[PDB]
Amino acid sequence: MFFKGFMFNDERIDRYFKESFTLRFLYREIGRQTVESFASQVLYITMTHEDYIYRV
Amino acid sequence: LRNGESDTKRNTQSQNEMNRTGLTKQYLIDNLQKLYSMRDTIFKTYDKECFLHIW
């Protein structure tokens, strides 16, 4: 749903990043009207900062 | 009575060639902080000019 088919090559990096994402915003409400727009925004933000995520 | 004569000719030619290469990588945290918004900065110029700005 949220990161639509976007997976980092390393398994631990992927698991920790997505666990942090789903833990930080567990009870927060999506900003946009629908889940597709929110998913697109999340995917864009992930793709743009993929290198920083990898290094960090 | 003894005489003599000598003669020599020594001729040397040489060639050298040295090919030295290197590669140094320094890791600093200051570079990671500057890394953050390089990709995002692309679409701030796209949004400013090409798209509508009022809801």
Side-chain angles (χ1 to χ4, degrees):
Chain A
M1 307 220 87
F2 309 146
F3 309 82
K4 281 190 171 306
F6 187 92
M7 285 152 182
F8 296 82
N9 305 343
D10 196 338
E11 178 34 5
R12 150 166 275 256
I13 284 197
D14 191 29
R15 149 163 282 263
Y16 263 27
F17 170 67
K18 288 167 173 167
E19 187 178 4
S20 304
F21 176 88
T22 195
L23 259 45
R24 167 67 162 185
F25 315 97
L26 203 54
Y27 44 79
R28 302 280 302 281
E29 301 146 287
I30 69 193
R32 269 45 162 177
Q33 296 197 10
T34 200
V35 72
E36 274 39 66
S37 304
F38 156 82
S40 80
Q41 293 290 332
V42 161
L43 178 52
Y44 150 80
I45 275 161
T46 306
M47 271 194 339
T48 300
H49 309 74
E50 71 169 2
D51 203 1
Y52 182 81
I53 290 169
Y54 251 107
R55 302 299 186 281
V56 162
Chain B
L1 163 59
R2 191 196 334 267
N3 303 38
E5 187 165 18
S6 303
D7 188 348
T8 60
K9 294 180 176 57
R10 183 179 57 80
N11 154 275
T12 68
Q13 331 183 304
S14 147
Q15 293 182 6
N16 304 337
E17 174 158 8
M18 172 87 77
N19 291 355
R20 216 53 261 166
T21 73
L23 181 163
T24 302
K25 313 189 311 185
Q26 326 173 20
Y27 304 71
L28 318 176
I29 276 175
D30 305 341
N31 274 357
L32 253 68
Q33 301 178 354
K34 311 214 291 169
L35 188 32
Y36 192 15
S37 62
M38 311 275 258
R39 297 205 177 181
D40 215 10
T41 308
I42 308 277
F43 306 111
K44 290 181 181 172
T45 51
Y46 278 111
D47 193 358
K48 145 63 151 173
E49 322 198 19
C50 299
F51 285 83
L52 199 63
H53 291 271
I54 168 155
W55 281 51

